[PDB]
C-alpha cells in the first residue's frame, strides 16, 4: 500500500537558464531572458563548467531518470538553424553520453523559456508564425544529433506561463503587456509548433528511435468556497480550463480550444481550421504534468474566479483523468521552494515532497490513475526567474558566492535518496 509500484520511474530535473551559467561562453547567443535580466532585473550553478559535479549528485540520489533542457541560443546563437556552435553541441552530447554510462534515462526539453534574442528582435518571437518552422528546424536538428540515446522528449515546458507571463503580465521575458491578443496568438503558435514537431518526429524519427514525445503543461488546483455550491464548482472548472484546458484540449482533446474560452475570448482567441484541429490532437505520447510554485505564485499567475487556490495534487490528477480520457501521466515537475537563507536543513521541502508523493500514490492505488513517473524539481539551486536567488528549489545546495560551487545535499536530497531505495515510505 505505502510502497510505489514496481518499475516506477523516479527522476529529477533542471532548466538550462537556471543552472547552466556561461551566458557568453563558447560563442553562445543571448536569450530573451539574458536580455530581460540585464534590462529588468553570478554564473548561477555553473553547470556548464561543473558538469561532472552535477553527475555526481545524480549518482548520489539514485534516480532512474534526469530531465534537463537544451539552450536553443547555445546551439544556434542567431536562432536560425544553419551552423551550430560546436562547443555547445559537445556539451549536450557529453552529458547524454555521461548519462547512458550510468544507465540514467534522459528526458530532454527543447524549450525552457530561453528564446534566442535574435529571433525576438527580428520577428517578434512567438508572435510570428514564421518561428513555428524555425522551431521545427531546431527540433529536427536535435532529434538527429541526440535522438539515438534519447527516448523521452518534451517540446515546450509550461506554455501557459510562456504566453501569460511573457505577454499578459510582463513578469517573464520578453516582458510584453497590455495586448490580450498577443497572449493568445503566442499560445496558438506554441501549440502549432508543438504539433508540427510531434508530426515531424512521428514521421521521420519514431520508426528508428521509438521514443516518447510530449509537452509539459503546468497548472494549479482550485477548490470551491462553499463545498457543495454548484456555482462555485463551475467557477473552479473555468479556472482549470483557463490554465490547463487551454493547451490540453487542442493537444490531448478534440484539437480545439475549450468551448468556454471560445465564447469568452471571441475577438482575441485565434481560430483553428478544421484541418488544423485534426493535426493538433493526438500529439503527445504521455501527459506531462507540472505542479509547482510557478503555477501558484504570484497571484496574477492565474484567474481564480474568486475561489480557493489549492495544492491538492491528487485532485488535479483526477481532473486530468476525467477530462482527458485517463491517460498515462508523468509528473514533469513537482516541488516547492524555500527562502534563500535556508541552506541544508530544508524541513519544509521534505514535508512538501512527502505531502505530494503521498497524494501521487493515492492517485495510483485508490483512483486507478496511470502515473508512471515523478520528476522531483531542481537538482540544484539556481536562478529562479524573476525571483532570481531570493528563493531556492534544489535538492542540492549551491553557494553562489563561492567560486567552487560544490553541490551539498540537503535533508530533502537524503530523503529523496531514501525514498528511491525503498520505492516509497
Amino acid at each position, epitope marked *: 500500500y505505502d510502497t510505489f*509500484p*514496481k*518499475n516506477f520511474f523516479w527522476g529529477i530535473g533542471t532548466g538550462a537558464l537556471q543552472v547552466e551559467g556561461s551566458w557568453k561562453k563558447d560563442g553562445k547567443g543571448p536569450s530573451i531572458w539574458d536580455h530581460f535580466i540585464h534590462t529588468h532585473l553570478n554564473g548561477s550553478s555553473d553547470s556548464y563548467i561543473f558538469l561532472e559535479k552535477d553527475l555526481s549528485a545524480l549518482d548520489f540520489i539514485g534516480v532512474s531518470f534526469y530531465q534537463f533542457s537544451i539552450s536553443w541560443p547555445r546551439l544556434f546563437p542567431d536562432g536560425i538553424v544553419t551552423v551550430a556552435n560546436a562547443k555547445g553541441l559537445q556539451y549536450y552530447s557529453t552529458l547524454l553520453d555521461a548519462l547512458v554510462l550510468r544507465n540514467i*534515462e534522459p528526458i530532454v526539453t527543447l524549450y525552457h523559456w530561453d528564446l534566442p534574442l535574435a529571433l525576438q528582435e527580428k520577428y517578434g518571437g512567438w508572435k510570428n508564425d514564421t518561428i513555428i518552422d524555425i522551431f521545427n528546424d531546431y527540433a529536427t536538428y536535435c532529434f538527429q544529433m541526440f535522438g539515438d540515446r534519447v*527516448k*523521452y522528449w518534451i517540446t515546450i515546458h509550461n506554455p501557459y506561463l510562456v504566453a501569460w507571463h511573457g505577454y499578459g503580465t510582463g513578469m517573464h521575458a520578453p516582458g510584453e503587456k497590455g495586448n490580450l491578443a498577443a497572449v493568445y496568438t503566442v499560445g496558438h503558435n506554441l501549440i502549432k509548433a508543438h504539433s508540427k514537431v510531434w*508530426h515531424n518526429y*512521428n514521421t521521420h524519427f*519514431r*520508426p528508428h528511435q*521509438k521514443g*516518447w514525445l510530449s509537452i509539459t503543461l503546468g497548472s494549479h488546483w482550485i477548490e470551491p468556497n462553499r463545498s457543495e455550491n454548484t456555482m462555485d464548482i463551475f467557477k473552479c472548472q473555468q479556472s482549470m480550463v483557463s490554465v490547463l484546458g487551454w493547451f490540453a484540449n487542442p493537444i*490531448h*482533446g*478534440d*484539437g480545439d480550444y475549450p468551448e468556454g474560452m471560445r465564447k469568452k475570448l471571441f475577438s482575441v482567441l485565434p481560430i483553428f481550421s478544421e484541418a488544423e484541429k*485534426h*493535426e*493538433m*490532437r*493526438g*500529439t*503527445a*505520447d*504521455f501527459f506531462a504534468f507540472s505542479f509547482g510554485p510557478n503555477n501558484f505564485k504570484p497571484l496574477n499567475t492565474m484567474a481564480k474566479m474568486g475561489q480557493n487556490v489549492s495544492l491538492n495534487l491528487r485532485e488535479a490528477l483526477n481532473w486530468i483523468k476525467l477530462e482527458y*480520457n*485517463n*491517460p*498515462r501521466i508523468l509528473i514533469a515537475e513537482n516541488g516547492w521552494f524555500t527562502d534563500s537563507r535556508v541552506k541544508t536543513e530544508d524541513t519544509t521541502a521534505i514535508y512538501m515532497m512527502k505531502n505530494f508523493l503521498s497524494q501521487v500514490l493515492q492517485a*495510483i*492505488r485508490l483512483d*486507478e490513475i*496511470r502515473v508512471f513517473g515523478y520528476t522531483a524539481w531542481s537538482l540544484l539551486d539556481g536562478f529562479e526567474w524573476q525571483d532570481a536567488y531570493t528563493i531556492r528549489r534544489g535538492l542540492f545546495y549551491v553557494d553562489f558566492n563561492s567560486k567552487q560551487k560544490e553541490r551539498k545535499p540537503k535533508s530533502s536530497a537524503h530523503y529523496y535518496k531514501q525514498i528511491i531505495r525503498e520505492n516509497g515510505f
Partner: antibody, heavy 123, light 109 residues
C-alpha cells in the same frame, strides 16, 4: 515462449468459475499479462490486465467488480476469477503477454498469445 | 472511454491488390498506443503492428501502419492468399483499453 489457458468449462448462470494461464520460456515477472475474450461469431473484447508485481490491475467496464485478476510470480501463473456469470460471458478466453517489459520503455502491444480456453455459461 | 470504429466491415479484393483499412477513435489518442492484429478462423490473434506504424517480429513489408489523432490506417500493398483474414485495431492510450469491431478482408472473385 508460451502461454496456456486452463480451467475452461461449463457454469450455471450466476455461478462462479476460475481460470488460469501458465507461462514458460521467459521471465514471467518482467511482463504484464492481459485477458482477452471472444464470443462465438464476435470480435475481440478486452477484459483485464495485471502488471509486474501484481499490485496494479485494470478492468473493462462490462466485467468490472465481478472478475478478479491475480498472479503468482513464483508459480509463473496468472488467474482470472469470474463470478455472477451471464450468458453473454460465454466466450473463449485468451491470456496475452504485453510486449512492454519492465525497464524497457517499449510501446505497448500483445505479442504472445495462448490457444484459449472456452467457457460456456448455461444451466 | 475510447470507442474504436472500423470501416469497412468487409473488404473484397483479389490477390495482388492494395487493401486500405481504417480505424476511427471517438476521442484522440497518441499513435504510440495503437496496434493492429490479424486473426484467422480457428487461430489465436497475431500482433501485426504496434505503435501505429511499427511492424511486429516476423511481419512482412507489405503491411504498413499510419495515422494520428483520431484516424489510423492499415495498408497491405500487395494482397497474398495468407493475408485474407480479419483485422482488429486496438488502443492502449486510454483506460479502459479497447478493440475495434474488426474488418474482414475477403477474396473478390
Amino acid at each position: 515462449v508460451q502461454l496456456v489457458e486452463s480451467g475452461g468449462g461449463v457454469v450455471q448462470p450466476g455461478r462462479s468459475l476460475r481460470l488460469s494461464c501458465a507461462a514458460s520460456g521467459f521471465t514471467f515477472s518482467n511482463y504484464g499479462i492481459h485477458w482477452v475474450r471472444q464470443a462465438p461469431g464476435k470480435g475481440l473484447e478486452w477484459v483485464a490486465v495485471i502488471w509486474y508485481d501484481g499490485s496494479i490491475k485494470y478492468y473493462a467496464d462490462s466485467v468490472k467488480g465481478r472478475f478478479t485478476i491475480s498472479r503468482d510470480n513464483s508459480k509463473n501463473t496468472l488467474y482470472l476469477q469470474m463470478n455472477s456469470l451471464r450468458a453473454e460471458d460465454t466466450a473463449v478466453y485468451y491470456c496475452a503477454r504485453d510486449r512492454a517489459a519492465a525497464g524497457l520503455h517499449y510501446y505497448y502491444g500483445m505479442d504472445v498469445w495462448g490457444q484459449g480456453t472456452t467457457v460456456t455459461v448455461s444451466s | 472511454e475510447i470507442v474504436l470504429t472500423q470501416s469497412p466491415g468487409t473488404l473484397s479484393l483479389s490477390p495482388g491488390e492494395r487493401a486500405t483499412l481504417s480505424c476511427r477513435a471517438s476521442q484522440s489518442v497518441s499513435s504510440t498506443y495503437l496496434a493492429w492484429y490479424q486473426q484467422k478462423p480457428g487461430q489465436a490473434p497475431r500482433l501485426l503492428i504496434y505503435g501505429a506504424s511499427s511492424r511486429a517480429t516476423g511481419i512482412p513489408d507489405r503491411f504498413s501502419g499510419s495515422g494520428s489523432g483520431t484516424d489510423f490506417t492499415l495498408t497491405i500493398s500487395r494482397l497474398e492468399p495468407e493475408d485474407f483474414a480479419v483485422y482488429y485495431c486496438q488502443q492502449s492510450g486510454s483506460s479502459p483499453l479497447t478493440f475495434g469491431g474488426g474488418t474482414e478482408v475477403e477474396i473478390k472473385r
